[PDB]
Amino acid sequence: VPSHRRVNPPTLRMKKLNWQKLPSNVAREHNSMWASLSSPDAEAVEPDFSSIERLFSFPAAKEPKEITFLDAKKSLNLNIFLKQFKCSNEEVAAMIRAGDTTKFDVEVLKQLLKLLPEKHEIENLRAFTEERAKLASADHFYLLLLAIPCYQLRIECMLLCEGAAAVLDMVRPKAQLVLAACESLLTSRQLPIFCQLILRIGNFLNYGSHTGDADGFKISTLLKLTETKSQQNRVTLLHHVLEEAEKSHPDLLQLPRDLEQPSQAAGINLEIIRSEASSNLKKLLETERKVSASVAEVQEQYTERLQASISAFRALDELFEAIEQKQRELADYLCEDAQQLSLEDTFSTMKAFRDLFLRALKENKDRKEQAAKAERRKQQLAEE
Amino acid sequence: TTALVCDNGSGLVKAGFAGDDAPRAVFPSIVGRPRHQGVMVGMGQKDSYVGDEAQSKRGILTLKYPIEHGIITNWDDMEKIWHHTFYNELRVAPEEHPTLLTEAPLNPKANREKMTQIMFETFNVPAMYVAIQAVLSLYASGRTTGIVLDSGDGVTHNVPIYEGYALPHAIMRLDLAGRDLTDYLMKILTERGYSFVTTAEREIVRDIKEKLCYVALDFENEMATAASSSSLEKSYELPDGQVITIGNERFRCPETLFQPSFIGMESAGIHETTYNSIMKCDIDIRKDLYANNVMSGGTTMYPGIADRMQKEITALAPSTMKIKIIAPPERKYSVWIGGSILASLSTFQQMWITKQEYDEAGPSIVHRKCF
Amino acid sequence: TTALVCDNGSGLVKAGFAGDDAPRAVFPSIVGRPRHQGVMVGMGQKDSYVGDEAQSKRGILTLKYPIEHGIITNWDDMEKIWHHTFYNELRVAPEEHPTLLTEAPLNPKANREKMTQIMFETFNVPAMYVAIQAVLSLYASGRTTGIVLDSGDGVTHNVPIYEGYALPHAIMRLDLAGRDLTDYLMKILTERGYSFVTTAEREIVRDIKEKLCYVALDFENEMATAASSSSLEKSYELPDGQVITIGNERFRCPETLFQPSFIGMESAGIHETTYNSIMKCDIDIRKDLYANNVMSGGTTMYPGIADRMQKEITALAPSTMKIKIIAPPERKYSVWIGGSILASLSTFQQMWITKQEYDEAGPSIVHRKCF
């Protein structure tokens, strides 16, 4: 008998508390308690619904035709985009037309190109004939955008000039660092004397074997200096060489001074920035050709900046060609063929070896400092 | 109808009307209870001070924070915080105003159920919304994509988001923020002989953390400068008239944000947490995220955090692509500013959570509606 | 004299004597250093802890797992692990026991040369032989020719073997193993609703992977009954009281071995790398490759992996209805047990590398005796 289900409907709205459900077929099993509860002989306690309805009930007893041709999501994104400028959209269409770069970085122009008007949207805006004030801020911004002749070309000039300036200021000091790196690698002063000391100790060590009696090595042998460990497994060969060089010939301690421009390597891949620079120069040439087909206002707005960008990227391509020529010189310098990676492997090699030089210097200084401290402690315990 | 934006943060509750630039009611979230006895009969000796009255009368009060590590622990206190910020500060009826609310990422679901049921059953509203704090912090910056690091009072969490799509797996959370820096400042101030043990003194240590502390650009050079010369020592006047002078503690206190081993945590600094957040994303969208690092929360008010953060990210990441830090001066209220931007839109009228939706779907439609 | 066999594992280094049924020492591949600063005396506390001692005191220790994906990168910590493995775990000196060793397949040649020169110069063993883990894994089953799937904690490989000699051209690599399965298991249990940020939670999920997870005979059919299976849903109790419920994920964690597109990479599975590795050999050996297919590692303890390997090789290869994939019950340590079988024999005495061979030939003897 469904005695618990027989409930009068309350006239007020009641708070809904959450709990999980069990189904009805699982409910009325014979060994379940609900076979006994559904019997009339069960002790049915009647609660006071009036006091609970006093307590736990709820205390709660234009121009919408904006005629927007967009959907909700793109209008929402364009409203978020429009509200960042803290000004009217008339000023926005003004500095789109006037050619200003102060308030437009790469991401804002990327968002603007990602919220371009579509063909049916432009057709619905042009077929519109009623009052312009009835439209949304999004549609009025699109009408102001369509009022600008060749607006997409101007936004592309904004995006490509700002991106070209950013890529030039990123790539040009690093390409100068690569040029200074390979120039200092081609002409180094104490690096022959360091190789003199290394090959003197190495030809002393591997006597009487098939690996002995050599008169040179590649630059990768500078990585293999760290693989050497002593009987204590604490002193490397590089530690012993710098410890002897600190006593005998300290000019090798000025060895990172000539090679500080090889330090930090390139840290990049040169083909990625070269492809990006070539793509940017191709896009600048295409944009200059498109502006040349456009009106003279766009010409006086953009042609000097496009020519400066094309000149700077041409100087960058000349610098890349110089990097290629010095790469061939560095391949012949270390006597390795040019088909293998002799540019990024050599810079990562030199950055790794200079970090090995700096840690070997500071660990030799720490070893001498702790030896001096232990000697002072021994003299202390001998005094006392 | 003017909506209400009410960021119920761990540190300070920031509430006001939508469509405005600055929040009207900014006040810390503490409940003060008198530990002593009353002898002076009458004059409204009310037993639980909430808000700025707890701040002003703090010398006789035990202060309890209802929010601990971005989790609403004490619920009666947090209801008193909501009652004070609706009735005493804004002085508005909740039944005639929508109320935007904020939340921390990776929150428990039953926590959202509980705030939804208090915001629909006790304080009845026509509509309300729950949003991620980092997403509103990004919307204050006006860009659609980027990574937002938010360091509140209990949580420093990283959320990268690309075109509004918040990546769930690349969100993570580090429990090291302003209260832990305050406790470490109590621990290191006893080296100079200044003792602060009471909860009343936590406001004083939080105040000197707000006023005098700053992020060092390099920790070792600032150590050598502080050890060499006493040029960086700064004085503070206590409310009892005593004047203290602190030295290296101006930069040893935010350095826990970059070195969590000071307070004894195995996890790395916020730069490494940002980096590991970036590697969890897809490799194509990382270029957008590296140039769009957005700070929010008042723990980024230290005036050396941007250049040090740029240095740490540029050192740790590969240097191929652009590193740019977005640190607006009003990023302390960027959660509230982004809520005011989001609440005042014509498209937002259909993402409101109405009373009828609550009656249909319990306090559970916020899971399937919001992210 | 009895010989020593050690499996230098990515997640578990095992060590013991030749002829034993089980390895005497099983310890994780960890090196611990003290996490906080502090010196005192404390009755001579050790500067570095390794293995079970590092596992036992691991709260005050930062750990290092120095093998990355089967391949050795940090060499000093391997030297410390080998010093623990001889001098304290088995309590031996390595200059009189011949020592069998294990390598990951497709090992770099400089790693093998460095391994041999550290065995001969530092430890000064009188005899050492490097074997691929798959060749020892075939030796535990007791045959000399065939392809073997070996998935440990670092990396998955399929290696063909001819008369005890491996073919390095047709060895194939799949970039997942039990560590990657453990990471994926934390990922989909986090998607189920849990969170594992601590050390002990990761060890509990490792023991969940040890106990509950299995491979079904059919993935699609067991998906088809996944909501309706009364026996699929298992659970586990953490000792502080947390309950972890696992359902279909019990056969989604190891099926990453069969289909690596579950996690988001397009690499071939443990049956597909096996099939492609069989076709890259000479044609004559391929029936012997199918006839002696042995799975090995702790990543093959999932029950019902044998009949699923049977069904997948049945699907790819129409000639393999009736040939059975051999799954020993002790193929946790089949690398070690096959090393015990190989080193304990009296036919292996010629194949050891002497000290004089390294002295006259250089380290490159590891290219030419171990093949």
Ligand SMILES: Nc1ncnc2c1ncn2[C@@H]1O[C@H](COP(=O)(O)OP(=O)(O)OP(=O)(O)O)[C@@H](O)[C@H]1O
């Ligand atoms: N019973 C089990 N069921 C499932 N997984 C297990 C079981 N026991 C151990 N594992 C897991 O499998 C791995 C152990 O496999 P194994 O001992 O072969 O690895 P390893 O030797 O360290 O690796 P590698 O051979 O790549 O060097 C670990 O990731 C461990 O967590």
Ligand SMILES: Nc1ncnc2c1ncn2[C@@H]1O[C@H](COP(=O)(O)OP(=O)(O)O)[C@@H](O)[C@H]1O
């Ligand atoms: N000017 C300041 N300088 C340094 N720290 C500040 C400053 N103002 C506030 N803070 C710190 O940042 C926090 C600001 O709180 P907020 O981020 O607005 O909310 P919550 O942290 O409660 O989520 C406070 O706890 C305070 O410790």
Ligand SMILES: [Mg+2]
């Ligand atoms: Mg906050």
Ligand SMILES: [Mg+2]
């Ligand atoms: Mg192993």
